[model samples]
Target: GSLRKQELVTQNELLKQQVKIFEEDFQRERSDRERMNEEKEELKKQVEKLQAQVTLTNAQLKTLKEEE
Candidate 1:
């Protein structure tokens, strides 16, 4: 029947639209995670710099105490 054929076509288009929406959301989530991971890496680098500074200060303090 012609009506049955039209319904099938409409359903297929609806399904295709849903698939497109899902793909777009998936891509957005992937980029978001990538940005978050890059920020985490930057923080890690900052922590390393702070640790080095603390070690240098501790060594200087020890030297001053020994000279007294």
Candidate 2:
């Protein structure tokens, strides 16, 4: 009993839209991870450099104080 009806909602068009949105969000998340890793490495280097400076200053202070 086929009566003519107009086709609507073809293949769930918004399904494609949802996938596109998810893909875009994942790209930003990947960028964030990359930047975070770089930040961690840079902070580690800074801490090492500051520790060396502190050791040098401490030794100098002790030597000068012993002169008193």
Candidate 3:
């Protein structure tokens, strides 16, 4: 009976360790996902800024051609 109890305790400890590892992994992944979302937002803003600049340049070119 003592040996059986020891085995049970060891199993519990192993399970606890596994759970802790999984928790850490989940937190790491969550952090990575948040970082990626932030990066995506920044890139989206950059794209919009560039698009506006292109439109303005194109309008200027049209005016120059008209003058020519």
Candidate 4:
């Protein structure tokens, strides 16, 4: 009966360790996902800025053509 109890204790310890490792892995993945989302937002802002610049340049070009 003592040996059976020891085996049970050992198994419980192993399960606890596994749970801790899994939690750490989950946190790292969550952090990675958040970082990716932030990068995507920054890229979207850059695209909008570039598009506005292009539109402004096109308008200037049209005005110059009209003047000529």
Candidate 5:
């Protein structure tokens, strides 16, 4: 009976260690997800700015053509 109890205690310790490692991995992935989201937002803003610039350039081109 004592030997079986000892075996279970050992298994419990190993499982606890395994869970700790998993939590660390999870935290790292969460941080990476946050970083990616921030990068995505910045890219979206850059795309919007570029689109606005293109629209302005097109308007200028039309005005120049009319004058010519």
Candidate 6:
């Protein structure tokens, strides 16, 4: 019947709108995780740099003690 056909067309537009909204939300969530990863990586780099400096200091301390 014509009524049943019209119902199907209405459902088609409803689904199209729903898909657009889902894509937008997914993109936003993806961007947020990317930002979090960058921050995590930076923190790791900072800790490694600090560790290297501490090791350097220990080496210098031993050298000074041996000289005396």
> Could you say which candidate leads in TM-score?
5
Q: Mind giving the per-residue lDDT tens digits that candidate 2 earns over 1-68?
A: 13322222433566778889999999999999999999999999999999999999999999999987
TM-score of every candidate relative to the true structure? 0.76, 0.75, 0.83, 0.77, 0.85, 0.63
List model 5 lDDT by residue over 17-68, tens digit each. 9999999999999999999999999999999999999999999999999999
Name the weakest run of 10 consecutive residues (lDDT summed) in model 1.
Answer: 3-12
Clashing pairs in 4: none
If both were scored by TM-score, which would come out higher, candidate 3 or candidate 6? 3
lDDT of 1: 0.98
* Residue-level error in angstroms, candidate 1, position 34: 1.4
Per-model CA lDDT versus the true structure: 0.98, 0.86, 0.99, 1.00, 0.99, 0.97
Candidate 1 lDDT, 1-68, residue by residue in tens: 99998999999999999999999999999999999999999999999999999999999999999998
Candidate number that wins on lDDT, 1 or 4: 4
Where's the lowest-lDDT run of ten residues in candidate 5? 20-29
Candidate 6: residue 62 lDDT (0-100) = 95
Q: Per-residue lDDT tens digits of candidate 4, residues 1-68?
A: 99999999999999999999999999999999999999999999999999999999999999999999
Which TM-score value belongs to model 6? Answer: 0.63
List, residue by residue over 1-68, the lDDT tens digit for candidate 3. Answer: 99999999999999999999999999999999999999999999999999999999999999999999
Checking candidate 3 for backbone clashes, the offending pairs are: none
Off by over 4 Å in 4: 1-8
Q: How many pairs of residues collide in each model? A: 0, 0, 0, 0, 0, 0
